[PDB]
Amino acid sequence: YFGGFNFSQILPDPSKPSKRSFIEDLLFNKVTLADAGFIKQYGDCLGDI
Amino acid sequence: AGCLIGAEYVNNSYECDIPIGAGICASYQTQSQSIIAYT
Ligand SMILES: *[C@@H]1O[C@H](CO)[C@@H](O)[C@H](O)[C@H]1NC(C)=O
C-alpha cells in the first residue's frame, strides 16, 4: 500500500526464475536479439542441423 | 564463458577481482594460498 499508487507492473514478480517485472519482460521480448555466441555454440556448429 | 581449469569453485560471494565471464570472477585467497572462482 503506497497511498493508492500501485507499482505492480514495474516491481519484480518472483514466480518466474528470472526476477523480472512485467514491463521489463515486454521490453526484453520486443527487441529481437541476434542470438550471438555469448553462450557457447561449438556443439551446435559441430552437429550439422 | 567457456570453462576453467586450475580454479576451484566456492559457494561464497565477494567483490569481483578478476573478471572472467557471465557473473563469474576469480581471486587469490587463503581459505594455503590458491586461486578460487566465485560469483
Ligand atoms: C494495481 O494494478 C494491479 C494490476 O494492474 C491490480 O491488481 C491492483 O489491484 C492495482 N492496485 C490498486 C490499489 O487497485
mmCIF file of N, CA and C and ligand atoms in Angstrom:
data_model
loop_
_atom_site.group_PDB
_atom_site.id
_atom_site.type_symbol
_atom_site.label_atom_id
_atom_site.label_comp_id
_atom_site.label_asym_id
_atom_site.label_seq_id
_atom_site.Cartn_x
_atom_site.Cartn_y
_atom_site.Cartn_z
ATOM 1 N N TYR A 1 0.855 -1.182 0.000
ATOM 2 C CA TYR A 1 0.000 0.000 0.000
ATOM 3 C C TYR A 1 0.892 1.232 0.000
ATOM 4 N N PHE A 2 0.893 1.959 -1.116
ATOM 5 C CA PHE A 2 1.732 3.140 -1.259
ATOM 6 C C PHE A 2 0.881 4.378 -1.502
ATOM 7 N N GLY A 3 -0.179 4.543 -0.717
ATOM 8 C CA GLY A 3 -1.045 5.693 -0.864
ATOM 9 C C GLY A 3 -1.987 5.644 -2.041
ATOM 10 N N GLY A 4 -2.282 4.457 -2.564
ATOM 11 C CA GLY A 4 -3.142 4.298 -3.710
ATOM 12 C C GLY A 4 -2.410 4.065 -5.013
ATOM 13 N N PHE A 5 -1.130 4.413 -5.075
ATOM 14 C CA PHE A 5 -0.302 4.116 -6.234
ATOM 15 C C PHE A 5 0.096 2.647 -6.196
ATOM 16 N N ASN A 6 -0.116 1.935 -7.297
ATOM 17 C CA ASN A 6 0.346 0.558 -7.417
ATOM 18 C C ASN A 6 1.496 0.490 -8.409
ATOM 19 N N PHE A 7 2.583 -0.144 -7.990
ATOM 20 C CA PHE A 7 3.759 -0.340 -8.822
ATOM 21 C C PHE A 7 3.919 -1.805 -9.205
ATOM 22 N N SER A 8 2.797 -2.516 -9.340
ATOM 23 C CA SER A 8 2.830 -3.957 -9.567
ATOM 24 C C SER A 8 3.369 -4.310 -10.944
ATOM 25 N N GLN A 9 3.214 -3.417 -11.918
ATOM 26 C CA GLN A 9 3.717 -3.684 -13.256
ATOM 27 C C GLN A 9 5.205 -3.403 -13.397
ATOM 28 N N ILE A 10 5.808 -2.671 -12.464
ATOM 29 C CA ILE A 10 7.228 -2.359 -12.540
ATOM 30 C C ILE A 10 8.045 -3.036 -11.443
ATOM 31 N N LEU A 11 7.417 -3.507 -10.372
ATOM 32 C CA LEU A 11 8.101 -4.301 -9.365
ATOM 33 C C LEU A 11 8.279 -5.735 -9.863
ATOM 34 N N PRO A 12 9.353 -6.417 -9.457
ATOM 35 C CA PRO A 12 9.589 -7.778 -9.951
ATOM 36 C C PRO A 12 8.588 -8.787 -9.411
ATOM 37 N N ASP A 13 8.335 -9.814 -10.222
ATOM 38 C CA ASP A 13 7.466 -10.925 -9.860
ATOM 39 C C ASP A 13 8.312 -12.162 -9.612
ATOM 40 N N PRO A 14 8.332 -12.711 -8.396
ATOM 41 C CA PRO A 14 9.230 -13.829 -8.087
ATOM 42 C C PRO A 14 8.742 -15.195 -8.548
ATOM 43 N N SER A 15 7.648 -15.269 -9.310
ATOM 44 C CA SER A 15 7.162 -16.559 -9.793
ATOM 45 C C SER A 15 8.092 -17.140 -10.851
ATOM 46 N N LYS A 16 8.480 -16.328 -11.830
ATOM 47 C CA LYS A 16 9.417 -16.771 -12.846
ATOM 48 C C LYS A 16 10.833 -16.837 -12.265
ATOM 49 N N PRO A 17 11.690 -17.729 -12.790
ATOM 50 C CA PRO A 17 13.050 -17.864 -12.227
ATOM 51 C C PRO A 17 13.920 -16.625 -12.366
ATOM 52 N N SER A 18 13.769 -15.853 -13.436
ATOM 53 C CA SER A 18 14.474 -14.585 -13.582
ATOM 54 C C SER A 18 13.593 -13.496 -12.985
ATOM 55 N N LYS A 19 14.065 -12.866 -11.911
ATOM 56 C CA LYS A 19 13.240 -11.918 -11.173
ATOM 57 C C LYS A 19 13.088 -10.632 -11.973
ATOM 58 N N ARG A 20 12.085 -10.608 -12.844
ATOM 59 C CA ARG A 20 11.917 -9.562 -13.834
ATOM 60 C C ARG A 20 10.460 -9.118 -13.842
ATOM 61 N N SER A 21 10.240 -7.830 -14.089
ATOM 62 C CA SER A 21 8.907 -7.259 -13.997
ATOM 63 C C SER A 21 8.142 -7.458 -15.303
ATOM 64 N N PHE A 22 6.901 -6.968 -15.328
ATOM 65 C CA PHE A 22 6.047 -7.134 -16.499
ATOM 66 C C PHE A 22 6.506 -6.246 -17.652
ATOM 67 N N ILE A 23 6.791 -4.972 -17.357
ATOM 68 C CA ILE A 23 7.251 -4.043 -18.383
ATOM 69 C C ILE A 23 8.632 -4.441 -18.882
ATOM 70 N N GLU A 24 9.492 -4.929 -17.986
ATOM 71 C CA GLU A 24 10.820 -5.379 -18.391
ATOM 72 C C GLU A 24 10.742 -6.629 -19.261
ATOM 73 N N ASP A 25 9.768 -7.507 -18.991
ATOM 74 C CA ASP A 25 9.519 -8.647 -19.872
ATOM 75 C C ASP A 25 9.050 -8.201 -21.249
ATOM 76 N N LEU A 26 8.182 -7.184 -21.301
ATOM 77 C CA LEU A 26 7.731 -6.651 -22.584
ATOM 78 C C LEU A 26 8.883 -6.031 -23.367
ATOM 79 N N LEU A 27 9.763 -5.302 -22.674
ATOM 80 C CA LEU A 27 10.918 -4.689 -23.324
ATOM 81 C C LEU A 27 11.916 -5.738 -23.798
ATOM 82 N N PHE A 28 12.087 -6.821 -23.036
ATOM 83 C CA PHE A 28 13.023 -7.865 -23.441
ATOM 84 C C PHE A 28 12.487 -8.675 -24.611
ATOM 85 N N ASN A 29 11.186 -8.963 -24.621
ATOM 86 C CA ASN A 29 10.612 -9.724 -25.721
ATOM 87 C C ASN A 29 10.402 -8.884 -26.970
ATOM 88 N N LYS A 30 10.374 -7.555 -26.843
ATOM 89 C CA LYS A 30 10.161 -6.714 -28.016
ATOM 90 C C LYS A 30 11.404 -6.631 -28.898
ATOM 91 N N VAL A 31 12.588 -6.534 -28.302
ATOM 92 C CA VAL A 31 13.827 -6.451 -29.072
ATOM 93 C C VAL A 31 14.276 -7.860 -29.435
ATOM 94 N N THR A 32 14.339 -8.146 -30.732
ATOM 95 C CA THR A 32 14.755 -9.455 -31.224
ATOM 96 C C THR A 32 16.276 -9.478 -31.301
ATOM 97 N N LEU A 33 16.902 -10.271 -30.436
ATOM 98 C CA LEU A 33 18.352 -10.334 -30.368
ATOM 99 C C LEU A 33 18.921 -11.079 -31.570
ATOM 100 N N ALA A 34 20.225 -10.915 -31.771
ATOM 101 C CA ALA A 34 20.928 -11.631 -32.825
ATOM 102 C C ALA A 34 21.299 -13.050 -32.424
ATOM 103 N N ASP A 35 21.091 -13.412 -31.149
ATOM 104 C CA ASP A 35 21.404 -14.732 -30.582
ATOM 105 C C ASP A 35 22.872 -15.101 -30.795
ATOM 106 N N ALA A 36 23.755 -14.178 -30.420
ATOM 107 C CA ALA A 36 25.183 -14.319 -30.656
ATOM 108 C C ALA A 36 25.789 -15.350 -29.704
ATOM 109 N N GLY A 37 27.078 -15.624 -29.889
ATOM 110 C CA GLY A 37 27.747 -16.670 -29.140
ATOM 111 C C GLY A 37 28.237 -16.276 -27.761
ATOM 112 N N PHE A 38 27.423 -15.518 -27.022
ATOM 113 C CA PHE A 38 27.735 -15.233 -25.626
ATOM 114 C C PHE A 38 27.627 -16.486 -24.765
ATOM 115 N N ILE A 39 26.691 -17.373 -25.076
ATOM 116 C CA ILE A 39 26.707 -18.744 -24.580
ATOM 117 C C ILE A 39 27.378 -19.587 -25.658
ATOM 118 N N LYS A 40 28.017 -20.686 -25.245
ATOM 119 C CA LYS A 40 28.826 -21.496 -26.149
ATOM 120 C C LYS A 40 27.973 -22.159 -27.228
ATOM 121 N N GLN A 41 28.533 -22.249 -28.436
ATOM 122 C CA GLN A 41 27.780 -22.739 -29.581
ATOM 123 C C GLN A 41 28.586 -23.661 -30.490
ATOM 124 N N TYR A 42 29.758 -24.141 -30.064
ATOM 125 C CA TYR A 42 30.511 -25.052 -30.922
ATOM 126 C C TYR A 42 29.857 -26.428 -30.996
ATOM 127 N N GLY A 43 29.103 -26.812 -29.965
ATOM 128 C CA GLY A 43 28.323 -28.035 -30.039
ATOM 129 C C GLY A 43 27.201 -27.963 -31.054
ATOM 130 N N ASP A 44 26.585 -26.788 -31.204
ATOM 131 C CA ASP A 44 25.557 -26.613 -32.223
ATOM 132 C C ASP A 44 26.154 -26.504 -33.620
ATOM 133 N N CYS A 45 27.371 -25.969 -33.735
ATOM 134 C CA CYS A 45 28.022 -25.864 -35.036
ATOM 135 C C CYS A 45 28.569 -27.204 -35.512
ATOM 136 N N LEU A 46 29.105 -28.021 -34.598
ATOM 137 C CA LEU A 46 29.635 -29.328 -34.978
ATOM 138 C C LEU A 46 28.521 -30.284 -35.384
ATOM 139 N N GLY A 47 27.421 -30.295 -34.637
ATOM 140 C CA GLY A 47 26.273 -31.088 -35.022
ATOM 141 C C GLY A 47 25.538 -30.445 -36.177
ATOM 142 N N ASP A 48 25.655 -31.038 -37.366
ATOM 143 C CA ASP A 48 25.105 -30.437 -38.574
ATOM 144 C C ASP A 48 23.588 -30.561 -38.609
ATOM 145 N N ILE A 49 22.899 -29.539 -38.110
ATOM 146 C CA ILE A 49 21.443 -29.479 -38.112
ATOM 147 C C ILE A 49 21.019 -28.391 -39.093
ATOM 148 N N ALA B 1 31.110 -18.720 -20.048
ATOM 149 C CA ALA B 1 32.098 -18.067 -20.898
ATOM 150 C C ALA B 1 33.230 -19.019 -21.259
ATOM 151 N N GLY B 2 32.897 -20.279 -21.506
ATOM 152 C CA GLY B 2 33.907 -21.307 -21.630
ATOM 153 C C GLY B 2 34.038 -22.043 -20.318
ATOM 154 N N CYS B 3 35.219 -22.572 -20.013
ATOM 155 C CA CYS B 3 35.375 -23.262 -18.741
ATOM 156 C C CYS B 3 36.793 -23.119 -18.210
ATOM 157 N N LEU B 4 36.909 -23.282 -16.895
ATOM 158 C CA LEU B 4 38.119 -23.010 -16.137
ATOM 159 C C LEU B 4 38.796 -24.305 -15.725
ATOM 160 N N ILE B 5 40.114 -24.342 -15.886
ATOM 161 C CA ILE B 5 40.946 -25.423 -15.382
ATOM 162 C C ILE B 5 42.017 -24.798 -14.502
ATOM 163 N N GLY B 6 42.053 -25.205 -13.235
ATOM 164 C CA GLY B 6 43.014 -24.690 -12.283
ATOM 165 C C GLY B 6 42.438 -23.809 -11.198
ATOM 166 N N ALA B 7 41.141 -23.511 -11.237
ATOM 167 C CA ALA B 7 40.492 -22.689 -10.225
ATOM 168 C C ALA B 7 39.270 -23.421 -9.697
ATOM 169 N N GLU B 8 39.183 -23.553 -8.378
ATOM 170 C CA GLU B 8 38.072 -24.250 -7.747
ATOM 171 C C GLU B 8 36.927 -23.288 -7.458
ATOM 172 N N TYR B 9 35.709 -23.817 -7.505
ATOM 173 C CA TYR B 9 34.505 -23.021 -7.318
ATOM 174 C C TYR B 9 34.071 -23.086 -5.860
ATOM 175 N N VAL B 10 33.903 -21.922 -5.240
ATOM 176 C CA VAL B 10 33.479 -21.831 -3.850
ATOM 177 C C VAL B 10 32.057 -21.294 -3.805
ATOM 178 N N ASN B 11 31.335 -21.666 -2.754
ATOM 179 C CA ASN B 11 29.948 -21.238 -2.569
ATOM 180 C C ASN B 11 29.884 -19.999 -1.680
ATOM 181 N N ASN B 12 30.589 -18.958 -2.112
ATOM 182 C CA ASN B 12 30.611 -17.690 -1.397
ATOM 183 C C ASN B 12 30.381 -16.548 -2.375
ATOM 184 N N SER B 13 30.558 -15.310 -1.921
ATOM 185 C CA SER B 13 30.388 -14.152 -2.791
ATOM 186 C C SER B 13 31.236 -13.010 -2.263
ATOM 187 N N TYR B 14 32.174 -12.544 -3.075
ATOM 188 C CA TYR B 14 32.994 -11.383 -2.765
ATOM 189 C C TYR B 14 32.884 -10.367 -3.896
ATOM 190 N N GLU B 15 33.609 -9.264 -3.743
ATOM 191 C CA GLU B 15 33.728 -8.280 -4.806
ATOM 192 C C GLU B 15 34.543 -8.873 -5.951
ATOM 193 N N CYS B 16 34.229 -8.458 -7.177
ATOM 194 C CA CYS B 16 34.891 -9.019 -8.350
ATOM 195 C C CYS B 16 36.328 -8.523 -8.439
ATOM 196 N N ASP B 17 37.277 -9.459 -8.398
ATOM 197 C CA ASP B 17 38.695 -9.135 -8.502
ATOM 198 C C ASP B 17 39.191 -9.260 -9.941
ATOM 199 N N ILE B 18 39.106 -10.457 -10.510
ATOM 200 C CA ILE B 18 39.479 -10.689 -11.905
ATOM 201 C C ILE B 18 38.233 -11.116 -12.670
ATOM 202 N N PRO B 19 37.745 -10.316 -13.617
ATOM 203 C CA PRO B 19 36.508 -10.675 -14.323
ATOM 204 C C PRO B 19 36.752 -11.777 -15.343
ATOM 205 N N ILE B 20 35.928 -12.820 -15.282
ATOM 206 C CA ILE B 20 36.011 -13.952 -16.204
ATOM 207 C C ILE B 20 34.878 -13.920 -17.222
ATOM 208 N N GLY B 21 33.635 -13.961 -16.756
ATOM 209 C CA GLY B 21 32.525 -14.119 -17.668
ATOM 210 C C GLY B 21 31.196 -13.664 -17.112
ATOM 211 N N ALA B 22 30.143 -14.440 -17.361
ATOM 212 C CA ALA B 22 28.778 -14.038 -17.029
ATOM 213 C C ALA B 22 28.555 -14.164 -15.526
ATOM 214 N N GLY B 23 29.048 -13.169 -14.792
ATOM 215 C CA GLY B 23 28.894 -13.118 -13.356
ATOM 216 C C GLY B 23 29.909 -13.903 -12.558
ATOM 217 N N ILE B 24 30.910 -14.500 -13.199
ATOM 218 C CA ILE B 24 31.913 -15.321 -12.531
ATOM 219 C C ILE B 24 33.212 -14.532 -12.467
ATOM 220 N N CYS B 25 33.824 -14.486 -11.286
ATOM 221 C CA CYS B 25 35.104 -13.826 -11.084
ATOM 222 C C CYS B 25 36.073 -14.796 -10.421
ATOM 223 N N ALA B 26 37.347 -14.406 -10.371
ATOM 224 C CA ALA B 26 38.381 -15.214 -9.742
ATOM 225 C C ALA B 26 39.248 -14.338 -8.854
ATOM 226 N N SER B 27 39.882 -14.975 -7.874
ATOM 227 C CA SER B 27 40.722 -14.262 -6.920
ATOM 228 C C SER B 27 41.741 -15.229 -6.337
ATOM 229 N N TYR B 28 42.709 -14.667 -5.617
ATOM 230 C CA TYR B 28 43.766 -15.421 -4.950
ATOM 231 C C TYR B 28 43.543 -15.310 -3.446
ATOM 232 N N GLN B 29 43.055 -16.383 -2.826
ATOM 233 C CA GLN B 29 42.662 -16.336 -1.423
ATOM 234 C C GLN B 29 43.374 -17.432 -0.639
ATOM 235 N N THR B 30 43.037 -17.528 0.648
ATOM 236 C CA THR B 30 43.713 -18.409 1.593
ATOM 237 C C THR B 30 42.865 -19.598 2.018
ATOM 238 N N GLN B 31 41.609 -19.369 2.388
ATOM 239 C CA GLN B 31 40.743 -20.441 2.865
ATOM 240 C C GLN B 31 40.318 -21.367 1.728
ATOM 241 N N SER B 32 46.726 -22.454 2.865
ATOM 242 C CA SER B 32 47.449 -22.451 1.598
ATOM 243 C C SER B 32 46.778 -21.526 0.593
ATOM 244 N N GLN B 33 47.570 -20.639 -0.005
ATOM 245 C CA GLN B 33 47.054 -19.700 -0.991
ATOM 246 C C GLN B 33 46.701 -20.434 -2.280
ATOM 247 N N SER B 34 45.539 -20.115 -2.847
ATOM 248 C CA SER B 34 45.076 -20.771 -4.060
ATOM 249 C C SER B 34 44.148 -19.837 -4.821
ATOM 250 N N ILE B 35 43.988 -20.125 -6.108
ATOM 251 C CA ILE B 35 43.087 -19.372 -6.973
ATOM 252 C C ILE B 35 41.700 -19.983 -6.864
ATOM 253 N N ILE B 36 40.725 -19.176 -6.452
ATOM 254 C CA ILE B 36 39.343 -19.620 -6.358
ATOM 255 C C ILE B 36 38.496 -18.812 -7.331
ATOM 256 N N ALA B 37 37.395 -19.419 -7.755
ATOM 257 C CA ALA B 37 36.433 -18.796 -8.650
ATOM 258 C C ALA B 37 35.073 -18.777 -7.973
ATOM 259 N N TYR B 38 34.354 -17.674 -8.126
ATOM 260 C CA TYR B 38 33.096 -17.485 -7.422
ATOM 261 C C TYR B 38 32.161 -16.676 -8.305
ATOM 262 N N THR B 39 30.956 -16.438 -7.800
ATOM 263 C CA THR B 39 30.038 -15.488 -8.406
ATOM 264 C C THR B 39 30.147 -14.155 -7.674
HETATM 265 C C1 LIG C 1 -2.595 -2.112 -9.297
HETATM 266 O O1 LIG C 1 -2.611 -2.896 -10.514
HETATM 267 C C2 LIG C 1 -2.782 -4.311 -10.328
HETATM 268 C C3 LIG C 1 -2.738 -4.934 -11.702
HETATM 269 O O2 LIG C 1 -2.962 -3.965 -12.717
HETATM 270 C C4 LIG C 1 -4.089 -4.588 -9.591
HETATM 271 O O3 LIG C 1 -4.198 -5.984 -9.339
HETATM 272 C C5 LIG C 1 -4.125 -3.817 -8.278
HETATM 273 O O4 LIG C 1 -5.377 -4.008 -7.632
HETATM 274 C C6 LIG C 1 -3.901 -2.329 -8.528
HETATM 275 N N1 LIG C 1 -3.901 -1.592 -7.274
HETATM 276 C C7 LIG C 1 -4.986 -0.979 -6.789
HETATM 277 C C8 LIG C 1 -4.806 -0.262 -5.484
HETATM 278 O O5 LIG C 1 -6.063 -1.004 -7.376
#
